[PDB]
């Protein structure tokens, strides 16, 4: 299986953060082929100092 990376363009004033977050939710809700309803909001996100700033 192939890994996925989500690119937050935090250096661009016209970046679309909402699109990236929606992509993150959709990957979780789709690629988890458990055969049951999945809630994508229940995810952990560990972030680095520079990214947080």
């Amino acid at each position: 299986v192939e890994k996925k990376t989500v690119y937050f363009d935090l250096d661009n004033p016209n970046a679309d953060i909402d699109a990236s977050i929606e992509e993150l939710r959709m990957h979780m809700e789709d690629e988890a082929k458990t055969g049951t309803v999945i809630n994508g909001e229940e995810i952990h996100v560990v972030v680095d100092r520079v990214f947080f700033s």
């Binding site: 909402d18 939710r25 809700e29 309803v37 809630n39 994508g40 909001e41």
Partner: protein, 52 residues
């Protein structure tokens, strides 16, 4: 496209209401279950209620 439009953005940014706050900084996923996800995106505007 509808959510990103300037006309809706400015109005809901200016409005001071729990609905306005939720739809701008909150989560739009508040619908029912379609069988693959627990909630579906929902947006309120002009009385109509859109769904994805």
């Amino acid at each position: 496209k509808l959510v990103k439009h300037p006309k809706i953005r400015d109005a809901y940014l200016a409005q001071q209401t729990p609905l306005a706050w939720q739809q701008i900084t909150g989560s739009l996923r508040t619908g029912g279950t379609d069988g693959v996800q627990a909630h579906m995106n929902t947006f309120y505007y002009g009385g109509v209620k859109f769904v994805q």
